[PDB]
């Protein structure tokens, strides 16, 4: 019922010690299940207590510090987001304060930037949502513990949607006791939902191998709209609208009034203005989820793209000297397979339509704090060069410009994608071809040939596929991979580079709709 026995739990800790079992062979993909993992608020260190039943898996030895046990953040091998513990014998508890036990199963992680909405959704909310669902009993029972050291931040209400239990910050841990011990704690975050890297080693851009699709993004979005008490019914008909993100701040669209009227007349549709500062986030999601089209300057507010309905168009505007192909966190999100969104990028090419602010503080794009020779190089540069992350002054100077949008220029850019009105399902892969057979042929003066046959993949018997083709590879015992062929039907006989006893390796695979490449069946050795 309500089993609270401090002495028995204390003896389990003093006799048994900490228990650790972790996934992954490297520290960049490691999530750890802990039992009786302890945290000393005085030392600000997690503690592994060695006892009778202690398990350390993996047991890295000195390699536990090369560089650490795991990544507490999803920003991969940062430097400031590592997790590690210090080792003590369980008997050392005799010389330490009486521990305070967390009977809740916990998820311990680091938020990267709780103030930036893009970082909140990409680094924290989506990884937390699916890290919880990796282990049974976490999705609706775990309490989140954020150890990075930031306050609640501007979007803490979003973190509280992930769990019925209120999350805890590191600063709140000292009020519980000098020595905290988690009876059951998971540590780390999955990187599987990430799609973008912020440019700490090479310039920023999309990840090389994105392991998430629009379907998984939209299942998370559907969960969030439910927690925000936003229905999923949609607007009527005739009430469709283009949604334009607005700002009070900076990075403004100076001719917003002209833009709203122009878009409304061009696309024969009402236009609506939305703002993160002037709307509750539930209202933001309510508006975005019916938007037939989303127009916004490049900024963190465009991460709300993941709430858009299928068939909507993202229109991202970039200020003067900002190359859209260099800053694609939202282009990547919108163009993910399964997202069912169209993306459009527009770039202000006209310097007479930009307004700079060189005298602002550094974090608002000001350049007054620099040598006048570097001020001159920035003022004369026509495009922000590629750079490494974070405090690049020319990037900050250009991204904090105000922009007068060239409306005809913008309409042409959108018209290359949206041909009529803006606004509103498959994706399966073939199986192996079955019973692949090949038959050499004796012909004429010992001519050879090769005839290959196969059955349809087993799952094709239940499928609605527009285009079904098959790809066949040949080879020559020990030479480079031969000709590839793409054919329509399950039969064929070959003619080129034939003739006697040669081991011909043949690979066959089925392909659905251009790009859905199925697996290769077992190779066929065909002797002539």
């Amino acid at each position: 019922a309500l089993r609270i026995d401090y002495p028995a739990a204390l003896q389990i800790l003093m006799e048994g010690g900490t228990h650790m079992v972790c996934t992954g062979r490297t520290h960049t993909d490691r999530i750890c299940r802990f039992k009786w993992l302890c945290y000393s608020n005085e030392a600000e260190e997690f503690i592994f207590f060695h006892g009778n039943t202690s398990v350390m898996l993996p047991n890295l030895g000195s390699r536990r510090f090369q560089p650490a046990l795991l990544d507490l953040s999803t920003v991969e091998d940062h430097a400031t987001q590592y997790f590690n513990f210090v080792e003590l014998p369980a008997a050392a508890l005799r010389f330490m304060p009486k521990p305070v036990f967390v009977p809740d199963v916990a998820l311990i992680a680091n938020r990267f930037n709780p103030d930036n909405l893009m970082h909140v959704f990409h680094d924290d909310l989506l990884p937390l949502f699916y890290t919880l669902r990796q282990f049974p009993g976490l999705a609706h029972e775990a309490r989140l513990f954020f150890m990075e050291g930031w306050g609640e931040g501007a979007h803490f209400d979003l973190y509280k949607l992930l769990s019925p239990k209120q999350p805890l910050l590191r600063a709140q841990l000292k009020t519980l006791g000098r020595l905290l011990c988690f009876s059951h704690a998971f540590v780390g975050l999955s990187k599987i939902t990430t799609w973008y890297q912020y440019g700490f080693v090479q310039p920023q851009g999309p990840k090389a191998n994105i392991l998430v699709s629009g379907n998984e993004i939209r299942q998370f979005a559907r969960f969030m709209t439910e927690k925000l008490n936003v229905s999923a019914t949609g607007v009527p008909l005739g009430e469709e609208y283009i949604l334009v993100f607005s700002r009070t701040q900076n990075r403004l669209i100076l001719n917003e009034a002209e833009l709203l009227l122009a878009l409304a007349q061009e696309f024969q549709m009402k236009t609506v203005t939305v703002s993160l500062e002037d709307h509750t986030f539930a209202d933001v999601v309510r508006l975005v989820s019916n938007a037939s089209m989303l127009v916004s300057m490049h900024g963190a507010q465009l991460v709300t793209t993941l709430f858009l309905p299928r068939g909507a168009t993202v229109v991202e505007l970039f200020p003067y000297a900002v190359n859209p192909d260099h800053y694609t966190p939202y282009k990547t999100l919108a163009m993910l397979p399964g997202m069912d969104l169209q993306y459009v990028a527009w770039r202000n090419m006209m310097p007479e339509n930009t307004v700079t602010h060189p005298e602002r503080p550094w974090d608002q794009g000001g350049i007054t704090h620099l040598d006048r020779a570097e001020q001159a190089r920035i003022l004369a540069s026509r495009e922000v060069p590629r750079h490494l992350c974070c405090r690049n002054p020319e990037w900050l100077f250009r991204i904090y410009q105000d922009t007068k949008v060239d409306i005809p220029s913008l309409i042409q850019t959108i018209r290359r994608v949206v041909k009529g009105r803006p606004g509103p399902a498959a994706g399966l892969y073939p199986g192996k071809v079955r019973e692949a057979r090949c038959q050499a042929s004796v012909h004429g003066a010992s001519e050879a040939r090769l005839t290959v046959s196969w059955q349809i993949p087993w799952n094709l018997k239940y499928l609605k596929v527009a285009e079904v083709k098959y790809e066949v590879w040949l080879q020559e015992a020990g030479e480079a991979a031969y000709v590839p062929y793409i054919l329509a039907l399950q039969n064929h006989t070959f003619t080129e580079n034939i003739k006697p006893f040669t081991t011909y390796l043949v690979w066959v695979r089925c392909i659905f709709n251009k790009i859905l490449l199925g697996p290769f069946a077992d190779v066929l050795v065909c002797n002539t």
Binding site: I4, Y6, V100, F101, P103, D104, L176, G177
Partner: peptide, 10 residues
């Protein structure tokens, strides 16, 4: 001696 999920009270 605390095994607490704990509410506050100022």
């Amino acid at each position: 001696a605390g095994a607490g999920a704990a509410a506050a009270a100022a």
